[PDB]
């Protein structure tokens, strides 16, 4: 009973629960007990919610940030359906009233007792919102398809909820005895030590004696800082290197434990391999104790000393700079700390950075202001999550201010908040409790929290923390654990299938590999594992019956799988596809697509719809992930191949794109396609310029039959090969309706580029704060400040709106001149 759950969690999280116990770590055991109770209490609160509130948990509303339409409606236990001519301005309730009235006339005799289910999807339409505010309806309006809904009664939803139940005295300087090492390298060994509070030094780094490569030291290392001046989040950072400089390894550790006790005495530090000091690095040792170089040290006893409780802490030209500052400016800000709190609360981040964290008096003064500091906007609170603000009280304050995040905003920044877990010092933290509580209150948040954590289980520095969080999540969600295992079983089968395809593609022809891929898929174990799951890309998308005949693979290096699905209940909306990719890291593609999706959110919040294609991309495992198939689309290169006997037969290369559009959009449909092409082109022109996406060719640009242009394969961003704006002749030709000269259409296009750009510029700090939190990911192209700088230049944030739009025209006209 409880035994099967534990063995289900182990298989699902990818780590045995026994491994947690084998550690004999009271920090681990205390996380597990406290979080289990927390997560079980979150599960209990859920079983007592109202049926609409339960819908808000399991099926949160997929909303969008007058005119009539046909809508098909049916009731749960019947095939009989009714089609109505409703208005987009109508609310679900009015639609539910019509359906109950038409059922009353047919069946010969209350709308608040029902909810509208999207046929063959894990999506519902409810709440006081007009129909055109729903994403599914909007998808059905832009394409032209008929929405299909099922009237679900309150008791049927309640049946779902039920079958888914579970001190200052120490004035002496800080010192450490550096005992000995046990490493490998070709020279002498120096052990550089240092004390840090986040990204900054609490004193100057102290080095060890040059001991030969053939190691013993037994050397006292004293730091220029008093033991009573040690901030609660003080970090001792070591670096072992070879010299005649060659780095060998690194290790960090917190001076206080999870129970606030200043650590004593002997410690063996299992070092991590080096690429010199790494304060941002994990404060947990290398779990590969058999091959890791170790540093044995001694924490001299000062006697049990604890960090003082909050009661003890609480007991103990300005405007022209507030928009990188000199020593005198820092002193000014500190003296005026009371003015900052009262008249500039949003400048807290700038005041936290000027405070002397190496002086216990200065810290307590700042902490007394923080304890009475007013709640900050989400935008400011996001800056406070950075490794640049390590203090636990500052971290707690950031969470307190982030509690007002809507489930939509939290979902948009979820990727960033999971990376911040990597900067954390202890297992039990406010961010974890926050993430878990929000995940257990929203099944879509929970789904993506799981997948962001599961995708990093093969990374030894996060495996313990991520495995512990996932376990606690499962305790508060036994039914979801089973749903996610079904996803893991399919992904496990797709891995084996892709391994076969890789082998078979080197030994025979594609029609032979495809047929045996099909033969492998038609096996019962594969038919069952690959069918009837929630999509890991989107839990509201149901991947029902696998369409073997339609399944294939791509010709690229890793031979990615093309898996098609169909759903009788969903009709046409159930015709969905997934791309299984194994061999490449999908983290950067995901980040890039999330950033484009954010841009689209921001343009839509300003009334601008640039017709973007925000398709799913999700890393699931070690160099493994999924991509959502965008159907009725092709690469520009494929359309430009000019294949014979087709409807897009072109005399000139320039005509191929427009000829393809004309064949997919005949008559009055053509003008609509050109508008879609132009809007989406402006969006991706701005997005790729702002994000610095280079290596753009006809093979990584796609078009939908609707005319919408989109980008694939984001292997390089932030100018990593200063990329210019890009305008292609083939595109300009389509924008200009197949005419050589058309200033009317081109100046409108230039306006879309101008507008899209200035909108992003106003939210330029949002992009900067999100990319700075993403530095914790370890993406080779987002590792330092020079990566962040690219965004600052492309957005021209250190300029005025009038001066930035001029600089954009300079770059736009350069791209138009390069266009043949």
Ligand X SMILES: Cn1nc(-c2cnc(N)c(-n3cc(C(N)=O)cn3)n2)nc1C1(c2ccccc2)CC1
**Among residues 151 and 517, whose Cβ is nearest to ligand X?**
517
Our CB check for ligand X shows the closer of 278 and 613 to be: 613
Q: Which range, of 229-237, 542-550, 629-637, 663-671, touches ligand X by CB under 6 A?
A: 629-637
Select the span of 270-278, 310-318, 416-424, 624-632 touching ligand X (CB under 6 A): 624-632
| Interface residue with ligand X, options 28, 262, 630, 774 (CB under 6 A) | 630
Q: Checking DSSP bridges between strand 68-75 and strand 81-87, what pairing results, if any?
A: antiparallel
The three-class DSSP label of residue 294 is strand
- Distance, in Å, from the CA atom of 366 to the CA atom of 195, rounded to the nearest integer, reads 21
- For residue 627, the minimal CB distance to ligand X (Å) is 5
# residues contacting ligand X (CB under 6 A): 14
**Extended strands (E) in 660-793:** 701-704, 709-711
Binding mask 575-594 for ligand X (x = CB under 6 A): ----x---------------
Smallest distance from ligand X to CB 754, Å: 29
To ligand X, the closest distance from the beta carbon of 232 in angstroms equals 46
Which residue has the closest beta carbon to ligand X? 630
* Shortest CB 377 distance to ligand X, Å: 35
Residues whose CB falls within 8 Å of the CB of residue 526, separated by 6 or more in sequence, listed in order: 493, 497, 520
433: exposed, middle or buried (Cβ count in 10 Å: 0-12, 13-18, 19+): middle
Closest residue by Cα to residue 604 from 62, 65, 63: 65
Distances in Å between the Cα of 149 and the Cα atoms of 74, 119, 123, 152, 515 are: 7, 5, 10, 9, 37
Is the distance from CB of 544 to CB of 532 less than 8 angstroms? Answer: yes
CB 517 within 8 A of CB 553: yes
- Which of 391/600 has CB closer to ligand X? 600
Q: Is the CB of 67 or the CB of 557 nearer to ligand X?
A: 557
Q: Is 596 in the site for ligand X (CB under 6 A)?
A: no
CB of 99 to ligand X, least distance (A): 35
**Contact stretch for ligand X (CB under 6 A) within 19-27, 159-167, 339-347, 630-638:** 630-638
Nearest CA among 45, 48, 55 for reference residue 114: 55
- Minimum CB separation of residue 586 from ligand X in Å reads 9
C-alpha 392: how far from its chain's center? Answer: 24
Stretch that binds ligand X, among 21-29, 507-515, 530-538, 628-636 (CB under 6 A): 628-636
Q: Does 633 bind ligand X (CB under 6 A)?
A: yes
Residue ranges of alpha helices (H) inside 260-359 are: 310-315, 318-321, 327-335, 337-343, 348-352
CA 391 – CA 423 distance, rounded (Å): 12
Footprint of ligand X on residues 677-736 (CB under 6 A)?
Answer: 712-713
Query: Which residue, 371 or 646, is less far from ligand X as judged by CB?
Result: 646
In whole angstroms, the minimum distance from the beta carbon of 711 to ligand X comes to: 9
Judge whether 723 and 715 are in contact, CB under 8 Å.
no
Residues in Cβ contact with 289 at an 8 Å cutoff, skipping those fewer than 6 apart: 270
Q: Are 40 and 47 in contact (CB under 8 A)?
A: no
Residue 359 structure tokens: 């002086």
Q: How far is the CB of 629 from ligand X (least distance, A)?
A: 5
Distances, alpha carbon 507 to alpha carbons 57, 513, 517, 558, 653, in Å = 49, 9, 14, 15, 36
Rounded to the nearest whole angstrom, what is the least distance from the CB of residue 612 to ligand X in the complex? 13
What's the rounded Cα separation, in Å, for the pair 672 and 640?
22
* The only residue of 627, 636, 679, 773 in contact with ligand X, by rule CB under 6 A: 627
- Choose the stretch contacting ligand X; rule: CB under 6 A; options: 299-307, 431-439, 622-630, 744-752: 622-630
- 337-345, 507-515, 623-631, 758-766 -> range binding ligand X (CB under 6 A): 623-631
Enumerate residues 442-461 that contact ligand X by CB under 6 A.
Answer: none
**206 in Cβ contact with 221 (< 8 Å):** yes
| Nearest to ligand X of 627, 796 (CB atom) | 627
Q: How many Å is the maximal CA-CA distance in the chain?
A: 96
Measured from the CB atom, is 154 or 552 closer to ligand X? Answer: 552
Q: Could you tell me the smallest distance in angstroms from the CB atom of residue 60 to ligand X?
A: 24
By CB under 6 A, the residues from 549 to 568 that bind ligand X are: 552, 554, 562
Tell whether residue 634 is a contact of ligand X (CB under 6 A). yes
Q: How far is the CB of 404 from ligand X (least distance, A)?
A: 35
In the complex, the smallest distance separating the C-beta of residue 562 from ligand X, rounded to whole angstroms, is: 4
Nearer to ligand X, 209 or 556 (CB): 556
Please tell me the distance from the alpha carbon of residue 516 to that of residue 498, in angstroms, as a whole number: 12
**SS3 (DSSP) at 275:** coil
Give the range of 189-197, 319-327, 380-388, 627-635 binding ligand X by CB under 6 A: 627-635
Q: Which two tokens stand for residue 557?
A: 């290096």
Beta carbon of residue 699, minimum distance to ligand X (angstroms, whole number) = 9
The residues binding ligand X (CB under 6 A) are: 552, 554, 562, 579, 615, 627, 629-630, 633-635, 638, 712-713
């Amino acid at each position: 009973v409880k035994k099967l759950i534990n063995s289900q969690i182990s298989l699902l999280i990818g780590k045995g629960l026994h491994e947690f116990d084998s550690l004999r770590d009271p920090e681990v055991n205390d996380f597990r007990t406290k979080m289990r109770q927390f997560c079980e209490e979150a599960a209990a609160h859920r079983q007592q919610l109202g049926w609409v509130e339960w819908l808000q948990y399991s099926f949160p509303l997929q909303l969008e940030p007058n005119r009539a339409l046909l809508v098909n409606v049916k009731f749960e236990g019947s095939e009989e359906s009714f089609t109505f001519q409703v208005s987009t301005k109508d609310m679900p309730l009015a639609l539910m009233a019509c359906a109950l009235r038409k059922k009353a006339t047919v069946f010969r005799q209350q709308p608040e007792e029902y909810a509208l289910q999207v046929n063959g999807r894990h999506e519902y339409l409810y709440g006081n919102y007009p129909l055109c505010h729903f994403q599914y309806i909007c998808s059905c309006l832009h394409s032209g398809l008929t929405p299909h809904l099922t009237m679900v009664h309150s008791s049927s939803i309640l049946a779902m909820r039920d079958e888914q139940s579970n001190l200052w005295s120490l004035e002496q300087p800080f010192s450490i005895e550096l005992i000995e090492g046990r490493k490998v390298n070709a020279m002498k060994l120096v052990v550089q030590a240092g004390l840090f509070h986040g990204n900054e030094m609490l004193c100057k780094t102290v080095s060890s004696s040059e001991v030969n490569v053939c190691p013993v030291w037994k050397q006292r290392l004293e730091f220029d800082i008093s033991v009573c001046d040690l901030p609660r989040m003080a970090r001792l950072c070591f670096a072992l290197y070879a010299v005649v400089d060659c780095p060998i390894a690194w290790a960090n550790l917190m001076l206080f434990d999870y129970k606030d006790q200043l650590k004593t005495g002997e410690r063996c530090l299992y070092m991590w391999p080096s690429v010199l000091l790494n304060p941002a690095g994990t404060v947990r040792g290398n779990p590969n104790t058999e091959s890791a170089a170790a540093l044995v040290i001694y924490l001299p006893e000062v006697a049990p000393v604890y960090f003082p409780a909050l009661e003890k802490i609480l007991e103990l030209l300005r405007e022209i700079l507030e928009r990188e500052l000199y020593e005198h400016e820092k002193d000014l800000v500190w003296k005026m700390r009371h003015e900052v709190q009262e008249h500039f609360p949003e400048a807290l981040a700038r005041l936290l950075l000027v405070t002397k964290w190496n002086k216990h008096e200065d810290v307590a003064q700042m902490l007394y202001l923080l304890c009475s500091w007013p709640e900050l906007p989400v935008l400011s609170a996001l800056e406070l999550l950075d490794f640049s603000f390590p203090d636990c009280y500052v971290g707690s304050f950031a969470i307190k201010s982030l509690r007002k995040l809507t489930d939509d905003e939290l979902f948009q920044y979820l990727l960033q908040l999971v990376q911040v877990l990597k900067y954390e010092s202890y297992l039990d933290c406010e961010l974890t409790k926050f993430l878990l509580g929000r995940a257990l209150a929203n099944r879509k948040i929970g789904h993506f929290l799981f997948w962001h954590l599961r995708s990093e289980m093969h990374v030894p520095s996060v495996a313990l923390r991520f495995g512990l969080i996932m376990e606690a999540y499962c305790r508060g969600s036994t039914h979801h654990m089973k749903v996610l295992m079904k996803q893991g079983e399919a992904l496990s089968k797709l891995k084996a299938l892709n391994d076969f395809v890789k082998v078979s593609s080197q030994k025979t022809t594609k029609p032979q590999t495809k047929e045996m891929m099909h033969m492998c898929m038609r096996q019962e174990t594969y038919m069952e594992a690959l069918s009837h799951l929630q999509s890991p890309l989107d839990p509201s998308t149901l991947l029902e019956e696998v369409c073997v005949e339609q399944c294939t693979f791509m010709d690229s290096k890793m031979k990615p799988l093309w898996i098609m699905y169909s759903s009788e209940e969903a009709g046409s909306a159930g015709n969905v596809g997934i791309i299984f990719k194994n061999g490449d890291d999908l983290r950067q593609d995901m980040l890039t697509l999330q950033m484009i999706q954010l841009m689209d959110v921001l343009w839509k919040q300003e009334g601008l719809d640039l017709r973007m294609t925000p398709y799913g991309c999700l890393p699931t495992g070690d160099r493994t992930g999924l991509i959502e198939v965008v159907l009725h689309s092709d690469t520009i290169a494929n359309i430009q191949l000019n294949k014979s006997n087709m409807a897009a037969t072109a005399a000139f290369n320039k005509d191929a794109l427009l000829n393809w559009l004309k064949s997919k959009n005949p008559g009055e449909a053509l003008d609509r396609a050109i508008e879609e092409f132009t809007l989406s082109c402006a969006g991706y022109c701005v997005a790729t310029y702002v994000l610095g996406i280079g290596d753009r060719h006809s093979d990584n640009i796609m078009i939908r039959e609707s005319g919408q242009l989109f980008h694939i394969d984001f292997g390089h961003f932030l100018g990593n090969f200063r990329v210019p704006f890009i305008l292609t002749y083939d595109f300009v030709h389509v924008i200009q309706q197949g005419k050589t000269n058309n200033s009317e259409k081109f100046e409108r296009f230039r306006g879309y580029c101008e507008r899209a750009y200035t909108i992003l510029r106003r939210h330029g700090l949002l992009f900067l704060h999100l990319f700075a939190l993403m530095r914790a990911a370890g993406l080779p192209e987002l590792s330092c400040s020079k990566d962040i700088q690219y965004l600052k230049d492309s957005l021209a944030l250190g300029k005025t709106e009038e001066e930035a739009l001029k600089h954009f025209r300079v770059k736009f006209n350069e791209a138009l001149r390069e266009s043949w």
